[PDB]
Design brief:
Largest interface: C-E, 59 and 46 residues
Strand order of the largest sheet of chain C: 1-2-3
Number of domains of chain D: 1
Order of helices and strands of chain D: EHEHEHEHEHEEHEEHEEHHH
Bound molecules: NADPH dihydro-nicotinamide-adenine-dinucleotide phosphate, iron/sulfur cluster
Helix content of chain D: 25-40%
Strand content of chain D: 5-15%
Radius of gyration of chain C: 22 Å
Organism of A: Ovis aries
Keywords: peripheral arm, mitochondria, electron transport
Strand content of chain C: 5-15%
Number of strands of chain C: 8
Radius of gyration of chain D: 20 Å
Entry title: CI Peripheral Arm focused refinement from Ovine respiratory SC I+III2
Largest sheet of chain C: 3 strands, antiparallel
Chains: A alpha+beta, B mainly alpha, C mainly alpha, D alpha/beta, E alpha+beta, F mainly alpha, G mainly alpha
Oligomer: part of a larger assembly
Chain A: NADH:ubiquinone oxidoreductase core subunit S8
Number of helices of chain C: 16
PDB class: electron transport
């Protein structure tokens, strides 16, 4: 099934050749293109004002991941190293120790935001949903030192909001 | 003005102009590769320096079979 | 002698071109490419399958789902898995969406690379809505991985196909207005008609693929000859070019956009409500509720994300009709959890191979028009 | 010394060398080359700056990820200086503007700046303080510049007795003051011996003095290998700059007409152990910007 | 076996078996292995003295057109004497078929350089020369495509490491970009993922 | 007919006699090939079958759609290419036995 | 072991091709040091060219010497063209090493280095 184009001959009927000559001399289709540009001139602009109207998004947006914690409880992570095993950029660095209580925990949970391609594999590989790719786009960092998140920048970032992250997960826990 | 003794003298001063030759110790049976102890690297340096100064193209097999300053002079007298 | 110009990486994509030109009408042009060299093949050799899937997502970067589809069909072909039907239909719908996206960016960047400024802005508003669809589906702006070997991961949320229907109607009107604006525009026809003719014999010997084969005669569609998926059940036709012109190739790209609109319409009208992923927990990860309240699902989740699934030993070469042409992937897999050696056939690389025959007897503005008129992204050309 | 002060492996670019250098000034010429060699060493460089962050932005990408650090200071408050040398292995004093201002003069920059920092670095408890001074800095007259640097040498010898006073000659480099000052002109003809020394040999001497003890306490002097006349120097730099031609203060012209002399009562480069380079190689390096398109090596070498 | 298992066809399998037997009958001089895989793509394993005869036969002969050339690679396999495997990947136009001509070579052997019978193989051959290290004799131009000029080492081998030996950085001494030995900031942790327990019994090689 | 679809393939004017003299040249050059090779048998078989299809056609479109090979002048290019490999396979002697074998522990894959 | 050659038959053509390539590299340096505006005299450049030729001096196999001739001829073509920049030609030299010593004692003060 092929539908091929560019097949016409110049018709030696007088009307077709005089219409092509009128196109060549009287500048028809160039003024037609001017008419199309004027038709988009008299529209309304499809712009949004940035610093007052932030653009639309999705409830599964990926960016600025942080660690969650239990409802009225401790840290949610286990240091099971699933996210370090699956991280395709190899950005995760986990060092684990148990505390005095006996539950297995961490010492070091360092992510390079510079190396992070922002997949979502550490969002989906975590069995207890400890690390979740957050909602927003607020990095804009002046130094290369500050884009290397420790465990405590991650926990302050997971304590700066959980209501957002809990709302997005409660919106979308029946798909994944 | 091209005489063979001028050829020998001009090869003599351009070999003196070459710096890495140590010592001077120049003759007609000098044999600057084994009696004077230099590489074939220095051989092709010297013969292309002859090419640069007053020579013909001087192909590399004929360049390799020179090995001697009087024989360089005689090859110059051959092709010129 | 003749003027040996050195066009550097400035913008007229990004390359270096050394042209020994004669006198405003050239003699011998050589593209020094490889400036955007990254090391994708060595990196995939030292990584696993699921982890090195985003390398196949971004080795080509304007197409973003056909490259995923090619690698996922390579792994699903080697691993002997037929994906479920609803995954196949969503894969077809997003293949047509990405095809529409790549053709419209190629049209607009060729128009701006000549110098026309405004339909760039119009059709990039349309492509902003395209990226809104990608955001709502996956969560990423551009680089949605989203296509696992084992079918579509995490199916589309409720309330999407109505938006795709609205976008279909409005986009048909907008491409009709693009043909209203350009296309019998006189100075643009004067800009590109008789430049870059390609004989079909040379189109086969120089290894041209996709749109170049459509423009230079011979009828060759992978979607029509070798149906690798449910394309055999949707009815469409491919456009063919009579003359080897650049204007002809432009018309062919516009009509492939229009046929992508047809396939999107029939794919919306004939969606089956089958399932997201395959019926095998050892390849696709199990869903999270069964993971939590099941032992074997937790074990398969844990091993399937640490070690990954193994692949039986063997070598395959599949290739699909990406909008640039026959995007090919040749996997060689020792029986293990990592691939042994992958390699990528790039239609942009094969098209850029014939730049001498496309720019032998023309001038340098026509050389810029020839570099623009093939959808070459210079990240895929590197491999 | 605590751990993470021991060295590790090879040199530079996240290869941990064993020094932490607080480098005063460091925004101009010589401090930028010294921060270059310390970032090549792979150290931690604490640079304090009082200027705009744009100049320390231009010297910023020298060190590796977070190796160098930036902090503010002033010439009035001892608290910011003690905050700068809270914990530091070594500290070097490289400061001084070649012309006066309305807020800081030649007076008391070289008296009030090094006394305060040497006092707070002795009280903070660091070792290996290296202070640069100009050659021929004497109590004898004809320069406010040179008599103030002589008072500075005497004061930094008096307080903090285990200091390394080191003194170069009129150093020349890629972004020099005096040789670029010679090229940017239009002139007279007199006789004056003067020996430039190239800047990378001087900073190799500084890093060898800063990581190679048995040189603490003793004052050193940098002597270039040339020691020749000024008139043939000017004609050589014009001949290499391809122009025939047969802030400009009085203190600068009297510095370039001061006869630089050397005394071997203090050791030079060989007792420290780094090779010196002659003029002409680096002179053909720095003398760009001839004309539109535009060798004759003079090599006077007097006495 | 009906859901979620890829259905194979036997018509293409029988046809590719018959055609591979036919090819090896009509070219007895250069043919060693004729294999058809389970998913019906033909592979012909070839001594490196017949690259030009096999490809001039296969581009022509009117019973197998094979006009188009795709991937060329020479997968860098240790453990053998002849390391590299050059894979010409031929696609027809009149037939809808795919064959892989796999010829073998070691590190120091010129293969017969298919640029004269496939003009698409020009940059493919130059790229395989630059990346692997297999010289191609009677060939117009061999330069370095996809690598830096001052870089060498033929990096796609298994012997060249992941990170290279040189690493560029700008410095203000010589006011330019210089090359230094690599000092990584993180280890690149290699994972020991190849678990035992023999996930495929059908591919067991016979032991000694 | 006039101006077929391919670009650098200008139309023919006499298909029948041109294709017949092409195949007489094929059978001649193939007559110079040795006999006990299989290549002579398969080529002479397929070329006699194709020529015998050509011998009894009065039309053009019937020959195009009846004889496989599709478009009429691509058949002519295909015939010229097969004559070129016949001239090349007078040389190169491919019917001789196998050239020297590999070390035989090589074509096994799974390593 | 009847091996296919590259160019040669024994070491004689190998020595002939390498002395041809050295003649080309000798007459190719001063043009480039005038062109790319380097900072190094012609004699030092020629000394490091002959040092690069003296580096591979223990090579005996004729195919290997043929392949080194091919490498040198490719790089000489890329330097007689203006494709390579100032960076790569200065990258042939070594001005920014701060070179590590070879005595056992200074390898002992910066240790773990056999
Ligand atoms: N001819 C030469 O170049 C020679 C120079 N020297 C010595 O080298 C040193 C550096 O000289 P050079 O780089 O050429 O010139 P600069 O004046 O540019 O370097 C001095 C540095 O200290 C800073 N500085 C100077 N005065 C003050 C002040 N009052 N308060 C705060 N910061 C100050 C300067 O500017 P900023 O405040 O912006 O940081 C700059 O960073 C001087 O001490 C000089 O005696 C020695 C021998 C020869
Ligand atoms: S996958 Fe989750 S529980 Fe496991 S180490 Fe990572 S964040 Fe912690
Ligand atoms: S999203 Fe970032 S941190 Fe998470 S797996 Fe990907 S690269 Fe690693």
């Amino acid at each position: 099934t092929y539908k091929y184009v560019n097949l016409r001959e110049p018709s030696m009927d007088m009307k077709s050749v005089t219409d092509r000559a009128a196109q060549t001399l009287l500048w028809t289709e160039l003024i037609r293109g001017l008419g199309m540009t004027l038709s988009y001139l008299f529209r309304e602009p499809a712009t949004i004002n940035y610093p007052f109207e932030k653009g639309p998004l999705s409830p599964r947006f990926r960016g600025e991941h942080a660690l969650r914690r239990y409802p009225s409880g401790e840290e949610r992570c286990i240091a099971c190293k699933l996210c370090e095993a699956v991280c395709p950029a190899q950005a995760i660095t986990i060092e684990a120790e148990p505390r005095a209580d006996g539950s297995r925990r961490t010492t070091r949970y360092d992510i390079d935001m510079t190396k992070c391609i922002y997949c979502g594999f550490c969002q989906e590989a975590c069995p207890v949903d400890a690390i979740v790719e957050g909602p927003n786009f607020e990095f804009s960092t002046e130094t290369h030192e500050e884009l290397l998140y420790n465990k405590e920048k991650l926990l302050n970032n997971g304590d700066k909001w959980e209501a957002e992250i809990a709302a997005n997960i409660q919106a979308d826990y029946l798909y994944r | 003005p091209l005489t063979l003794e001028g050829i020998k003298d001009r090869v003599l001063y351009v070999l003196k102009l070459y710096d890495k030759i140590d010592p001077e110790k120049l003759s007609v049976n000098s044999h600057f590769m084994k009696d004077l102890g230099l590489d074939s690297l220095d051989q092709v340096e010297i013969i292309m320096a002859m090419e640069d100064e007053f020579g013909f193209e001087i192909p590399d097999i004929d360049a390799e079979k020179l090995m001697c300053p009087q024989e360089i002079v005689d090859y110059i007298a051959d092709k010129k | 002698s003749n003027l040996t110009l050195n066009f550097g990486p400035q913008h007229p994509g990004v390359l270096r071109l050394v042209m020994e030109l004669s006198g405003e009408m050239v003699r011998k042009c050589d593209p020094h490419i490889g400036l955007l060299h990254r090391g994708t093949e060595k990196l995939i050799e030292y990584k696993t399958y699921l982890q090195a899937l985003p390398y196949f997502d971004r080795l080509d970067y304007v197409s973003m789902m056909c490259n995923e589809q090619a690698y996922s069909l390579a792994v699903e072909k080697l691993l002997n898995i037929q994906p479920p039907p609803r995954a196949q239909w969503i894969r077809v719908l997003f293949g047509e969406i990405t095809r529409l996206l790549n053709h419209i960016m190629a049209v607009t960047t060729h128009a701006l690379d000549i110098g026309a400024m405004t339909p760039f802005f119009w059709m990039f508003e349309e492509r902003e809505k395209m990226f809104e669809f990608y955001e709502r589906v996956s969560g990423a702006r551009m680089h949605a991985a989203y296509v696992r070997p084992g079918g579509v991961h995490q199916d589309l949320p409720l309330g999407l196909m109505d938006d795709i229907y609205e976008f279909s109607k409005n986009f048909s009107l907008r491409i009709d207005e693009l043909e209203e604006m350009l296309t019998n525009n006189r100075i643009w026809r004067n800009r590109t008609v008789d430049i870059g003719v390609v004989t079909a014999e040379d189109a086969l010997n120089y290894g041209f693929s996709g749109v170049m084969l459509r423009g230079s005669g011979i009828q060759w569609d992978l979607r029509k000859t070798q149906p690798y998926d449910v394309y055999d059940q949707v009815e469409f036709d491919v456009p063919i070019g009579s003359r080897g012109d650049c204007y002809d190739r432009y018309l062919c790209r516009v009509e492939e956009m229009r046929q992508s609109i047809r396939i999107i319409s029939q794919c919306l009208n004939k969606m089956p409500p089958g399932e997201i992923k395959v019926d095998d927990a050892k390849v696709s990860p199990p869903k999270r509720a069964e993971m939590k309240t099941s032992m074997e699902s937790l074990i398969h989740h844990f091993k399937l994300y640490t070690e990954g699934y193994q692949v039986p030993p063997g070598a395959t070469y599949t290739a699909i009709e990406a909008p640039k042409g026959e995007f090919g992937v040749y996997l060689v897999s020792d029986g293990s959890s990592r691939p042994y050696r992958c390699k990528i056939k790039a239609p942009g690389f094969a098209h850029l191979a014939g730049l001498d025959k496309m720019s032998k007897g023309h001038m340098l503005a026509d050389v810029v028009a020839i570099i623009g008129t093939q959808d070459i992204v210079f990240g895929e050309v590197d491999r | 010394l605590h751990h993470a002060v021991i060295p590790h492996g090879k040199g530079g670019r996240s290869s941990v060398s064993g020094i932490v250098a607080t480098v005063f000034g460091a925004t101009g010429f010589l401090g930028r080359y010294l921060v270059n060699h310390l970032g090549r060493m792979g150290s931690q460089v604490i640079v304090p700056y009082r200027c705009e962050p744009y100049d320390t932005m231009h010297l910023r990408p020298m060190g590796d990820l977070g190796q160098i650090i930036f902090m503010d200071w002033n010439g009035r408050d001892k608290d910011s200086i003690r905050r700068a040398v809270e914990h530091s292995n070594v500290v070097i004093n490289l400061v001084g503007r070649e012309w006066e201002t309305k807020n800081f003069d030649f007076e008391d920059v070289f008296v009030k700046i090094p006394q305060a920092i040497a006092q707070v670095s002795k009280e903070a408890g660091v070792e290996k303080f290296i202070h640069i001074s100009h050659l021929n800095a004497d109590i004898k007259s004809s320069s406010k510049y040179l008599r103030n640097k002589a008072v500075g040498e005497k004061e930094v010898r008096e307080t903090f007795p285990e200091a390394t006073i080191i003194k170069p000659a009129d150093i020349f480099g890629r972004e020099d003051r005096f040789l670029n000052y010679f090229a940017n002109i239009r002139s007279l003809g007199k006789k004056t011996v003067k020996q430039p020394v190239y800047i990378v040999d001087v900073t190799k001497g500084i890093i060898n003095a800063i990581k190679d003890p048995d040189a603490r306490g003793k004052t050193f002097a940098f002597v270039g290998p040339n020691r020749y006349l000024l008139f043939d120097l000017v004609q050589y730099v014009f001949a290499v700059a391809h122009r025939p031609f047969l802030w400009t203060t009085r203190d600068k012209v009297e510095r370039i007409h001061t006869t630089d002399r050397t005394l071997p009562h203090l050791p030079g480069l060989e007792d420290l152990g780094v090779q010196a380079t002659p003029l002409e190689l680096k002179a053909i390096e720095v003398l760009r910007r001839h004309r539109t398109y535009r060798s004759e090596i003079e090599d006077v070498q007097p006495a | 076996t009906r859901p979620t298992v890829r259905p194979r066809n036997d018509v293409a399998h029988k046809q590719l078996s018959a055609f591979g037997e036919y090819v090896a009958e009509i070219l007895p001089k250069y043919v060693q292995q004729v294999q058809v895989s389970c998913f019906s793509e033909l592979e012909i394993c070839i001594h490196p003295d017949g690259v030009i005869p096999v490809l001039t036969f296969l581009r022509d002969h009117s019973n197998a057109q094979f006009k188009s050339l795709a991937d060329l690679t020479a997968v860098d396999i240790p453990t053998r004497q002849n390391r590299f495997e050059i894979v010409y990947n031929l696609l027809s136009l009149r037939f809808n078929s795919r064959i892989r001509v796999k010829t073998y070579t070691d590190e120091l052997t010129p293969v017969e350089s298919s640029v004269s019978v496939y003009k698409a193989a020009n940059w493919y051959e130059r790229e395989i020369w630059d990346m692997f290290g297999v010289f191609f004799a009677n060939h117009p131009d061999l330069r370095r495509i996809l690598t830096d000029y001052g870089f060498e080492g033929h990096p796609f081998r298994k012997d060249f490491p992941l990170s290279g030996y040189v690493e560029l950085r700008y410095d203000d001494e010589v006011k330019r970009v210089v090359a230094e030995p690599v000092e990584l900031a993180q280890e690149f942790r290699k994972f020991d993922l190849n678990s035992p327990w023999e996930a495929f019994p059908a591919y067991r090689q016979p032991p000694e | 007919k006039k101006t077929t679809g391919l670009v650098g393939l200008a139309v023919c004017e006499t298909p029948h006699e041109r294709l017949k003299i092409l195949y007489t040249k094929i059978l001649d050059v193939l007559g110079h090939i040795p006999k006990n090779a299989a290549y002579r048998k398969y080529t002479e078989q397929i070329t006699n079958e194709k020529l015998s299809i050509v011998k009894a056609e009065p039309d053009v479109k019937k020959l195009e759609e009846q004889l496989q090979g599709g478009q009429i002048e691509e058949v002519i290019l295909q015939a010229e290419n097969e004559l070129s490999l016949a001239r090349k396979m007078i040389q190169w002697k491919p019917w001789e036995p196998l050239v020297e074998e590999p070390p035989a522990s090589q074509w096994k894959w799974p390593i | 072991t009847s091996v296919k050659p590259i160019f040669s038959r024994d070491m004689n053509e190998a020595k002939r091709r390498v002395r041809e390539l050295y003649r080309a590299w000798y007459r190719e340096v001063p043009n480039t040091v005038h062109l790319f505006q380097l900072d190094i005299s012609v004699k030092q450049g020629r000394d490091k060219v002959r040092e690069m030729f003296k580096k591979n001096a223990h090579v005996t196999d004729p195919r290997v010497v043929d392949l080194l001739v091919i490498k040198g001829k490719m790089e000489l073509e890329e330097t007689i063209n203006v494709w390579k920049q100032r960076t790569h030609v200065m990258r042939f030299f070594h001005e920014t090493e701060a070179p590590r010593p070879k005595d056992f004692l200074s390898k002992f003060y910066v240790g773990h280095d056999p």
